[PDB]
């Protein structure tokens, strides 16, 4: 059975650059997918979108809209030390956190810093 690590690697293989907001979205998809035993359907939706000609970025977004565990779901809160622990390619995608962020509206995750600061990662 496909593991979260393997799915991450498969999805990363299709992405340009590294440590981008789409890479973090892969991590969030794999994490929530693993916790809901849904890695198989996520992988199948990913492959199906690619096979139709969608960009890998669009395929990842379509997963957040097509796989029921992501529908109307809040972004995971991720505790970190400083803004530095966030990858360089994500820095310009960080925003103040909106009242009710949703993954299927492009809010990938909420980073929670040590001092109480919080930032939402937006696609
Ligand atoms: O393979 C699995 O069993 C599923 C899995 C487990 C952990 C990760 N993560 C990391 O290893 C990691 O560094 C996570 C981050 O989102 C992160 C991104 C930047 C800085 C610090 C962190 Cl902790 C990231 C992570 C950690 C906590 C909550 C959500 C996520 Cl995506 C992803 C998938």
UniProtKB/Swiss-Prot annotation:
Phenotype upon changing residue 92 to A: Partial loss of IRF3 promoter inhibition. Complete loss of dsRNA-binding
Record annotation: effect of changing residue 22 to A: Complete loss of interaction with host PRKRA and subsequent immune response inhibition
Residue ranges constituting the VP35 IID domain according to the UniProt record: 1-123
Free-text description of this protein's post-translational modifications in UniProt: Phosphorylated by host IKBKE. Phosphorylation contributes to efficient viral replication and transcription.
Crosslink position(s): Glycyl lysine isopeptide (Lys-Gly) (interchain with G-Cter in ubiquitin): 92
Location(s) in or outside the cell: Virion; Host cytoplasm
Location of Phosphoserine modifications: 93, 100
Record note on what altering residue 95 to A does: Complete loss of IRF3 promoter inhibition; dsRNA-binding and interaction with host PRKRA
Function: Plays an essential role in viral RNA synthesis and also a role in suppressing innate immune signaling. Acts as a polymerase cofactor in the RNA polymerase transcription and replication complexes. Serves as nucleoprotein/NP monomer chaperone prior to the formation of the large oligomeric RNA-bound complexes. Regulates RNA synthesis by modulating NP-RNA interactions and interacting with DYNLL1. VP35-NP interaction controls the switch between RNA-bound NP and free NP and thus the switch between genome replication and genome packaging into the nucleocapsid.
Family, as annotated: Belongs to the filoviridae polymerase cofactor VP35 family.
UniProt note: domains: The interferon inhibitory domain (IID) binds dsRNA.
Subunit-structure text: Homodimer. Homooligomer; via the coiled coil domain. Interacts with nucleoprotein NP and polymerase L; VP35 bridges L and NP and allows the formation of the polymerase complex. Also interacts with VP30; this interaction is regulated by VP30 phosphorylation. Interacts with host IKBKE and TBK1; the interactions lead to inhibition of cellular antiviral response by blocking necessary interactions of IKBKE and TBK1 with their substrate IRF3.
Protein's name according to its UniProt entry: Polymerase cofactor VP35
Species in which this protein is naturally found: Zaire ebolavirus (strain Mayinga-76)
Source organism phylogeny: Viruses, Riboviria, Orthornavirae, Negarnaviricota, Haploviricotina
Whole-protein coverage range: 218 to 340 of 340
């Amino acid at each position: 059975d496909i593991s979260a690590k393997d799915l991450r690697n498969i999805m990363y293989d299709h992405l340009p650059g590294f440590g981008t907001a789409f890479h973090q979205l892969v991590q969030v998809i794999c994490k929530l997918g693993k916790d809901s035993n849904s890695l198989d359907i996520i992988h199948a939706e990913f492959q199906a979108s690619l096979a139709e000609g969608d960009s890998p970025q669009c395929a990842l977004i379509q997963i957040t809209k097509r796989v029921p565990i992501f529908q109307d779901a809040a972004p995971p809160v991720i505790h970190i030390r400083s803004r530095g622990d966030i990858p360089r390619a994500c820095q310009k995608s960080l925003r103040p956190v909106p009242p009710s962020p949703k993954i299927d509206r492009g809010w990938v995750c909420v980073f929670q810093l040590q001092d109480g600061k919080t930032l939402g990662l937006k696609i």
